[PDB]
Amino acid sequence: CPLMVKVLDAVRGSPAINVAVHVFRKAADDTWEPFASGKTSESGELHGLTTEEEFVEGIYKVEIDTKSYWKALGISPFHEHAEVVFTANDSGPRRYTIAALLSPYSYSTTAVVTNP
Amino acid sequence: CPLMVKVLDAVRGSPAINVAVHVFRKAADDTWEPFASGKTSESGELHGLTTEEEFVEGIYKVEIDTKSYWKALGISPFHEHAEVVFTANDSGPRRYTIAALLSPYSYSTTAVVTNP
Amino acid sequence: CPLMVKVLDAVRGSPAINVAVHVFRKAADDTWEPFASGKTSESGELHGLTTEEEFVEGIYKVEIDTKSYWKALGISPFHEHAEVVFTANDSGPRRYTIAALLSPYSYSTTAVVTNP
Amino acid sequence: CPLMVKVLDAVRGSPAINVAVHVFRKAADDTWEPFASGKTSESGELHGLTTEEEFVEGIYKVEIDTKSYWKALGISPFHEHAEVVFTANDSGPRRYTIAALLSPYSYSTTAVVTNP
Numbered sequence: 195c196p197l198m199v200k201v202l203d204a205v206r207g208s209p210a211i212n213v214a215v216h217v218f219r220k221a222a223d224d225t226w227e228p229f230a231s232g233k234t235s236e237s238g239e240l241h242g243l244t245t246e247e248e249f250v251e252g253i254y255k256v257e258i259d260t261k262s263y264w265k266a267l268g269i270s271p272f273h274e275h276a277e278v279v280f281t282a283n284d285s286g287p288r289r290y291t292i293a294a295l296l297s298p299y300s301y302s303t304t305a306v307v308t309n310p
Numbered sequence: 311c312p313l314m315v316k317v318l319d320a321v322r323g324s325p326a327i328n329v330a331v332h333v334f335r336k337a338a339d340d341t342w343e344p345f346a347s348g349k350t351s352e353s354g355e356l357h358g359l360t361t362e363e364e365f366v367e368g369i370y371k372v373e374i375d376t377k378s379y380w381k382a383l384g385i386s387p388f389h390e391h392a393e394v395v396f397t398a399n400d401s402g403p404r405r406y407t408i409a410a411l412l413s414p415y416s417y418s419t420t421a422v423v424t425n426p
Numbered sequence: 427c428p429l430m431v432k433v434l435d436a437v438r439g440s441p442a443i444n445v446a447v448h449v450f451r452k453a454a455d456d457t458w459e460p461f462a463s464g465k466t467s468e469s470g471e472l473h474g475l476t477t478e479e480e481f482v483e484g485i486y487k488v489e490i491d492t493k494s495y496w497k498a499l500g501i502s503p504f505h506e507h508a509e510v511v512f513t514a515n516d517s518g519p520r521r522y523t524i525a526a527l528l529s530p531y532s533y534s535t536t537a538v539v540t541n542p
Numbered sequence: 543c544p545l546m547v548k549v550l551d552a553v554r555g556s557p558a559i560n561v562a563v564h565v566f567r568k569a570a571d572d573t574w575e576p577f578a579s580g581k582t583s584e585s586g587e588l589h590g591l592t593t594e595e596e597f598v599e600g601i602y603k604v605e606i607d608t609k610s611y612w613k614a615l616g617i618s619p620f621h622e623h624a625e626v627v628f629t630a631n632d633s634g635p636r637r638y639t640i641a642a643l644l645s646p647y648s649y650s651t652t653a654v655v656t657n658p
């Protein structure tokens with residue numbers, strides 16, 4: 195699998211567990227079409243979203259449902275969700291990790307792109 | 311000025327100047343309607359986007375055009391843009407500062423919310 | 427004011443008020459000598475730490491007393507403090523803003539450096 | 543091993559490879575005594591720094607030698623190093639991951655503390 199998502203909690207110092215993640219691919223008419231989805235594991239990670247054959251070049255959006263995560267902890271958050279929008283490019287390294295670090299009023303996101 | 315956007319560059323240690331910003335508001339049919347737009351000044355700040363009268367309750371999306379910023383400086387970055395999606399004014403009028411700190415493969419965003 | 431410190435709270439979406447800050451400068455025997463100190467105001471900012479005359483070339487350490495900040499709000503955080511260590515004025519006088527964004531188990535820090 | 547260090551590069555979107563890391567423990571006279579050290583691997587990770595028997599409660603400092611990392615890439619950085627100072631506590635979960643995300647003029651750090 196060429197795409198993994200990892201989510202961390204900056205308030206508790208822990209993985210962010212059971213967070214819903216939705217991935218979309220941009221269609222030719224500029225709409226966002228559902229591509230893959232899941233929930234983070236006990237390690238904060240979501241594996242197996244796609245395959246090499248399916249993950250062709252194009253623009254993708256990863257939506258992390260942060261508002262529901264904070265509400266289940268009893269904490270009032272700012273954002274509706276965190277959105278990560280990027281182009282997949284076959285020239286570059288082949289494995290994409292999209293990571294996010296969550297606080298109630300802030301988030302940080304980075305990409306780690308590597309070649310096995 | 312109940313909505314201000316501030317952008318910093320983590321590579322240069324400077325304000326991020328001339329960054330385009332587009333704000334949208336979710337309409338009653340669930341589409342994103344254009345609401346306001348502008349670009350950051352020499353201080354990295356974008357003022358004057360809206361007014362207390364026009365900035366009603368709603369779900370707003372602040373799109374910060376990070377790719378165009380980096381490409382103008384000769385850098386091929388990861389993200390298409392940074393998107394900040396939040397509900398505003400649901401407990402009455404507030405003042406919002408949306409800030410972002412930019413790197414080629416990462417960004418952080420936070421909100422400062424005050425009650426005038 | 428060639429040195430300013432700004433601190434934000436990522437849990438509340440607000441300035442971090444009443445945060446103690448201690449600045450040190452490395453001496454010719456390699457020890458950290460006390461240089462200046464203060465606390466952040468209602469805006470999260472600490473002004474007036476030093477002057478253009480006293481802020482000579484050197485290696486400086488800005489210690490932001492994050493643990494004491496969180497403990498006063500009822501939160502047991504991870505870090506003792508946040509430390510920012512940098513060489514200043516090695517190409518002539520500059521103005522430095524040291525900013526930090528705080529969560530219980532995380533912090534981000536960045537510098538804005540300008541030439542007056 | 544109860545302590546792991548992980549370092550990421552926000553400019554290149556990659557692990558930060560071959561970064562020197564030094565760990566110190568605070569002594570009774572308030573000085574910092576060398577405890578363990580190493581260099582990050584090709585995955586940006588440094589394993590095997592200590593053992594359960596040796597990693598007793600106390601105050602520790604993790605110094606990440608970011609300045610040398612950026613200089614070897616040809617990039618002028620701001621900080622001398624990144625410093626992470628924290629108390630180890632036997633009550634909490636048993637495995638500490640200290641992670642840092644590096645840019646030339648900024649860094650973010652978080653702790654992930656979990657129980658096997």
Ligand SMILES: Cc1c(Cl)cccc1Nc1ncccc1C(=O)O
Nearest residue numbers: 409410411418525526527534535536
């Ligand atoms: C310091 C910082 C980090 Cl580390 C990350 C994101 C924004 C900021 N800065 C701000 N964020 C919100 C409002 C104001 C600022 C500022 O730096 O003036």
Ligand SMILES: Cc1c(Cl)cccc1Nc1ncccc1C(=O)O
Nearest residue numbers: 293295302306641642643650651652
């Ligand atoms: C340490 C950190 C910060 Cl400070 C901010 C955002 C992500 C991370 N962590 C990661 N980011 C990307 C890929 C992996 C990780 C990780 O911590 O395993």
Ligand code: NA
Nearest residue numbers: 399400401402
């Ligand atoms: Na309401």
Ligand code: NA
Nearest residue numbers: 515516517518
């Ligand atoms: Na010089």
